[PDB]
Design a protein around this nucleic acid. Structure first.
Lengths: 63, 141, 313, 223, 206, 101
RNA sequence: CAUGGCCGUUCUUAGUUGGUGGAGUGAUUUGUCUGCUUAAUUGCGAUAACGAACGAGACCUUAACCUACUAAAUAGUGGUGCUA
RNA sequence: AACUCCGUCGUGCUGGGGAUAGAGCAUUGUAAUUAUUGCUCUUCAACGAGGAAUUCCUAGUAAGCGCAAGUCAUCAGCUUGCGU
């Protein structure tokens, strides 16, 4: 039941395609970046957005 | 000056507070000795922190535990929660930190939640039943 | 340059290592697990060192730590927007430093323990006293101040102290605390500057970051000297105190660079059992020992690895 | 005094509800929209939120000096310890209470239902609303009741943002055939929201980065 | 054993047998072993406990109840038929009395007698129901190793409860009588009479 | 000077905390000993009606809550500055009482 | 069984509908789907559709953690006096 | 409150169970008879685990156990919550 929805997924792809050489492969320093490069209303959502961003980058540097 | 650590232990409503200072070796619960914690079939539950790591470690410290809240079984699980945390936190501050891991290893390998209080909490009642999940009997005709 | 074992006892990434000139076998490491651990080195192949005191009391990741010259006092820079001054004996905190609006990434102290500098993610740099008073706010970066260092001045104790402050804004800036003004600006880094350091004599500036390159500078000369390439994202950076070497913590391993002449000393890749190639643990902190024979490297394995130099034949 | 805060704070609530129902019944013909009390020492004051203040404030101070007496007689206030103000309405095209009374009185002038209701939804859209919806339910033109709903824009009715961006009003309009029900929901957009949240909870905005120069000219500039 | 003296007396019989070996009430988890393979990894006598009162989360996963010690799985099955639900402090007394009585009648380790009872009284071939339409015929199937332990504790504590019901002998003694008569295949126990009855029904239906 | 006590009671968190903040800000504008805001436990007032008029349907229940937040600050001040600070910080929804001694 | 409002239920589920384009004389249809996945018309994808809206989620309340910040004779703790 | 310890009972519809009924003393109320309710002594019924059927429930849950509140002047074998 861990399926991210099209709010988290679509936002994370838009946040990679214009901030690629600022995001690491680490979650703890990615969610600190999402407070600066994005406006997200709730703390629970930006942890989900930054987590899927970190998951996408692990499969970007693979291929 | 009188090296002392205070800590707390919890079970379900109960909160034991331990006062671990350096001294002669009295282990008193609510002003009464540890040998008198009396559901008397869970008397050994306050005794595992005194026997897992060995009784020698308590010869130089003083323990004073006070409990409130909970029930008779829940409180017994709260002193042992506070005794275990009260000795590993004494060792973090006033003796070698290498010794703290050796006692933390002993309690965790025998984890009856001696160091980490369990996150099981009551579920609220709802309407249409006498319990959280239980429902009233329906009659159908 | 061979290893004689590891150090266990941290539960997170060992973010920063720091050693003291006073005690040569006192290592202080701060990690992701909100604690600092002071060790006692024994020089044994099975257990090179043991922990002796844990410094807990930070509410979030502790990014940087530093010792004093005599090793009695320790500073911790943490993500809880505070800095703490610790006694290495009896593990207590004397002073708490507050006033950053965001995470604190680095802390350094001068040799005389008079001023304390601290970079942060609020794009500002604050200079602190020993009693917790913030002297001034050295603003002027455009992004997170990723790391700061104080430059050791030259001999005979001339009253001129300079600090160097890298950042994600792709400028390295040299500051002048005699007037609390910017002294020099360094331009040419093409990515985030993760780490920077200075020579023991206080002339060289080495800085590196995401691109896979290290740029050497000369603060005395105010010219860039040249750049190297490491092909890997650079995490930490450390000058050898007497061997005239530059150690770099990369995504693949520890690369040690000699500059006279220009060649690679070694590429340290420890043996990891049970992981894949992508999930390769890497060093995120470097610290040469005070005597200059030993380098330490904290990893994302949550384990400190120890390398000490040895001549081949 | 000499009353517990549990009974004190509740009694302030029921006093407000009694005042509000009084002014809906009394100032129905002046487009009333709400009140707020400011319990201060030395003459607690009451503000009336009604569109035509020139009607609420009568000729030479009548029609609000009367209402000042009516409140202090019924609620046993000391004379001069309550005053009634009337500042008008903040953007009456966006209040569902005021737009339901407009919908009600337009029906009582014998306007057709589909015309009186499409004239309310298009006025609320003209007022910068993101979505509003008007329901008329009753015996509209037959003996068997139906319900017609008129909508434009979009409305959210799911959760906590309902408490933030939805304004609702129910009105009973009394007709020859019976009673019709008027329900107006108005969703003010969160962009012009002054206090509280200013966006929907699942709305994300990415700050557009500024592109940089590649070579960056490796050099030093000094002071 | 070099006893330690301190301001709280902590009586002599406490630490003498418990500082070095963590026994049962006073009983040993040494030299006890499951004689029947396919019940190892389901009968847990490997980590000793002091009393059979462990406020442990064993219901949150599928097979985690196997790691619960079997002595606590017998005190758990005693709190049954309504008036005794949630009365664990009574069930520990019954089991504490049972292992004392078991040692008296037979001088072996009472923990070993319990494991012998569990290993015997678990059914080995059980019967399931095949509906189809109408007569609802039966089919003989195998039985899991976990269900063998699950049902052996069920049959033993049901038999002790029914024997002690309208009887002057206490529940502790009838539990002792049932466990001893099941350690050997005496067929004077409720569980053994049940176990071979379930097995002979499946033999007809195979 | 005189020993005073100011008690604040409201149903709005945001409207109450800034009023107490103005109280303490005026307290160390011209310095005097604080005994700053001691927050009492919040009171939840529950009304559990059924759901309906007439009892047709599933027996569904509602619960309504009013939350009472209470704060008291124990100050001491000269007699002059008492009246002005008790009169400046007046905000709707917040009930302020001042005990003389 | 003339109505309003409120409520229950269909309905402990995932469902519903415009705009433009395509199919059909038309009622209607596609979008809203073979497969896999999810608690979910949740997603991956496929694609005569594209771009959307409500519902789900997000949200709010509450229960768990904080030896961190802000301080409390209307909550405690320790020492100190006096005293059994 | 269940619970815990020590004792009395001892397989007997018995010291289980407490329906039905008699006599008195009080309390609320303008008023208690068709017993408001509480208490004291006496009376000591069926019921020996409940057929076909059928309800609720997956973890601090089921079940046991009481407590506060609503209704209220008096009446809780009900409900809404709460903990053990």
């Amino acid at each position: 039941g861990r399926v991210r929805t099209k709010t988290v997924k679509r936002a994370s792809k838009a946040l990679i395609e214009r901030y690629y050489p600022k995001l690491t492969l680490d979650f703890q320093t990615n969610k600190r970046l999402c407070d600066e490069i994005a406006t997200i209303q709730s703390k629970r959502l930006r942890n989900k957005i930054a987590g899927y961003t970190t998951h996408l980058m692990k499969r970007i540097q693979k291929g | 000056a009188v090296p002392s650590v205070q800590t707390f232990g919890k079970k379900k409503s109960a909160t034991a507070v331990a006062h671990v200072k350096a001294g002669k070796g009295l282990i008193k619960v609510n002003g009464s000795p540890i040998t008198l914690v009396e559901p008397e079939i869970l008397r050994f539950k306050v005794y595992e922190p005194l026997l897992l790591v060995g009784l020698d470690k308590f010869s130089n410290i003083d323990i004073r535990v006070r409990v409130t809240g909970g029930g008779h079984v829940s409180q017994v699980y709260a002193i042992r929660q506070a005794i275990a945390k009260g000795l590993v936190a004494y060792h973090q501050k006033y003796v070698d930190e290498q010794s703290k891991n050796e006692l933390k290893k002993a309690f965790t390998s025998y984890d009856r939640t001696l160091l980490i209080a369990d996150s099981r909490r009551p579920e609220p009642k709802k309407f249409g039943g006498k319990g959280a999940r239980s429902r009233f009997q329906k009659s159908y005709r | 340059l061979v290893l004689r074992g590891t150090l266990e006892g941290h539960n997170g990434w060992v973010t920063s290592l720091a050693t003291s000139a006073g005690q040569p076998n006192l290592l202080l490491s701060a990690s992701r697990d909100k604690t600092l651990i002071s060790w006692k080195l024994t020089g044994d192949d099975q257990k090179f060192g043991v922990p002796v005191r844990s410094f807990k009391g930070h509410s979030h990741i502790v990014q940087d730590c530093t010792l004093t010259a005599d090793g009695a006092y320790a500073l911790s820079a943490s993500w809880d927007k505070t800095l703490r001054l610790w006694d290495v004996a009896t593990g207590e905190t004397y002073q708490r430093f507050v006033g950053h609006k965001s995470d604190v990434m680095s802390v350094d102290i001068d040799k005389k323990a008079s001023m304390i500098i601290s970079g942060s993610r609020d794009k500002t740099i604050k200079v602190w006293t020993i009693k917790g008073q913030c002297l001034a706010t050295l603003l002027g970066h455009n992004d997170w101040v990723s790391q700061v260092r104080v430059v050791p001045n030259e001999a005979a104790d001339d009253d001129s102290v300079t600090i160097i402050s890298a950042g994600n804004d792709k400028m390295v800036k040299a500051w002048n605390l005699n007037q609390f003004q910017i002294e020099a600006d360094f331009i040419g880094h093409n990515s985030n500057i993760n780490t920077l350091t200075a020579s023991p004599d206080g002339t060289l500036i080495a800085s590196a970051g995401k691109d896979g390159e290290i740029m050497l500078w000369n603060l005395a000369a105010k010219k860039a000297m040249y750049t190297l390439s490491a092909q890997d994202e650079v995490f930490s950076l450390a000058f050898s105190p007497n061997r005239y070497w530059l150690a770099a913590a990369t995504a693949t391993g520890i690369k040690v660079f000699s500059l006279d002449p220009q060649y690679l000393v070694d590429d340290l890749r420890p043996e990891f059992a049970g992981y894949s190639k992508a999930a390769e643990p890497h060093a995120v902190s470097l610290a040469w020992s005070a005597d200059g024979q030993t380098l330490f490297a904290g990893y994302t394995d949550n384990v400190i690895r120890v390398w000490q130099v040895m001549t081949a034949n | 005094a000499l009353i517990s805060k549990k009974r004190k704070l509740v009694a302030d609530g029921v006093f407000y509800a009694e005042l509000n129902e009084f002014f809906t019944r009394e100032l129905a013909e002046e487009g009333y929209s709400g009140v707020e009390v400011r319990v201060t020492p030395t003459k607690t004051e009451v503000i009336i939120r009604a569109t035509r203040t020139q009607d609420v404030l009568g000729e030479n101070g009548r029609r609000i000096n009367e209402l000042t007496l009516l409140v202090q007689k019924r609620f046993k206030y000391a004379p001069g310890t309550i005053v009634l103000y009337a500042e008008r309405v903040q953007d009456r095209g966006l209040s569902a209470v005021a737009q339901a009374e407009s919908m009600k009185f337009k029906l009582l002038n014998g306007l057709a239902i589909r015309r009186a209701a499409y004239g309310v939804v298009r006025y609320v859209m003209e007022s910068g609303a993101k979505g509003c919806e008007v329901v008329v339910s009753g015996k509209l033109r037959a003996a068997r009741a139906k319900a017609m709903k008129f909508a434009d824009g979009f409305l959210i009715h799911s959760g906590q943002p309902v408490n933030d961006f939805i304004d609702t009003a129910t009105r009973h309009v009394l007709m020859r055939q019976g009673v019709l029900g008027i329900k107006v929901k108005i969703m003010r957009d969160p962009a012009k929201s002054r206090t509280g949240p200013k966006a929907l909870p699942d709305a994300v905005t990415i700050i557009e980065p500024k592109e940089e120069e590649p070579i960056l000219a490796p050099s030093v500039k000094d002071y | 054993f070099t006893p330690v003296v301190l301001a709280t007396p902590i009586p002599e019989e406490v630490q003498q047998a418990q500082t070095e070996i963590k026994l049962f009430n006073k009983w040993s988890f040494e030299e006890v072993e499951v004689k029947d393979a396919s019940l190892v990894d389901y009968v847990q006598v490997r980590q000793p406990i002091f009393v059979a009162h462990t406020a442990g989360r064993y219901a949150n996963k599928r097979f985690r109840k196997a790691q619960c010690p079997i002595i606590e799985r017998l005190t758990n099955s005693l709190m049954m038929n309504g008036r005794n639900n949630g009365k664990k402090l009574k069930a520990v007394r019954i089991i504490k009395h049972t292992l004392d009585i078991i040692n008296v009648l037979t001088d072996q380790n009472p923990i070993q007698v319990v494991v012998d009872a569990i290993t015997n009284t678990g059914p080995r071939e059980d019967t399931t129901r095949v509906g189809g339409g109408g007569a609802a015929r039966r089919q003989a199937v195998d039985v899991s190793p976990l269900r063998r332990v699950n049902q052996a504790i069920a049959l033993l504590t049901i038999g002790a409860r029914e024997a002690a019901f309208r009887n002057i002998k206490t529940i502790a003694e009838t539990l002792a009588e049932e466990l001893i008569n099941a350690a050997k295949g005496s067929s004077t126990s409720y569980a053994i009479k049940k176990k071979d009855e379930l097995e002979r029904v499946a033999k007809s239906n195979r | 000077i005189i020993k005073i006590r100011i008690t604040l009671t409201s149903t709005k968190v945001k409207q109450l905390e800034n009023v107490s903040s103005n109280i303490v800000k005026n307290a160390e504008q011209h310095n005097l000993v604080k005994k700053g805001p001691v927050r009492l436990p919040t009171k939840v007032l529950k009304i559990s009606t059924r759901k309906t008029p007439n009892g047709e349907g599933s027996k569904t229940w509602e619960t309504y809550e009013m939350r009472i937040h209470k704060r008291y600050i124990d100050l001491e001040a000269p007699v002059q500055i008492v009246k002005r600070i008790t009169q400046i910080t007046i905000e709707p929804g917040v009930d302020v009482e001042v005990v003389v001694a």
